[PDB]
């Protein structure tokens, strides 16, 4: 399963 990205840049 692929991660759910909560915040990014």
């Amino acid at each position: 399963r692929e991660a759910i990205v909560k915040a990014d840049e």
Partner: antibody
Amino acid sequence: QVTLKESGPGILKPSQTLSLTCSFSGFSLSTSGMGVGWIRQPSGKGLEWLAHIWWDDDKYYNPSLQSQLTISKDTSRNQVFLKITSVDTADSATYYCAHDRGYYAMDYWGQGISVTVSS
Amino acid sequence: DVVMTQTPLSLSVSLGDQASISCRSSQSLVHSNGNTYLHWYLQKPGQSPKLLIYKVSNRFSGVPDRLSGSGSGTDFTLKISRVEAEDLAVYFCSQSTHVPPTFGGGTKLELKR
């Protein structure tokens, strides 16, 4: 100026529940994008991810450990909590809480707390 | 989980030389959103890990441009130019594209003298 510090017992017995607390400063879990993670490292071994909690109450768990793990927070006191039920010697490790960038890369870490599961 | 194969296990280099560390993933680290979630850390004995590089090439604040990351897909490299005594540490990659995040087995960096 982000700092984190783990607290909890240095030793407990197999079958008991491990209760860890992360206390942090330099950021708030009320701020959008913020997250705190727990990661452990048995002596001389590799890191293992445990759980993350986010500013919006979203929580994520290591799928192979989730039946043992509960993460929670007290945003008002800048604390995050981890509970691990039914510990055994395999759970002996240094436990770290960490500030997250948003995608499970941890850019500030606590000093770590050594936890030994033993009779 | 996704396996990070990190090579070499140990590295002993002359002062001022370059050190190069490779990390290969068991599958592509390109997220469906198009970004690549691969990071580099170090850890000195008795100390917590320290973030060096996030998302393949971005240096974390305080990290000298002496250290650089590159790669794509399944193949990634950390390069440390002008190795100095303060660089002594175990270095490791980490993927977080997939759950759970996983970590390279480490490369111990030692220096000649």
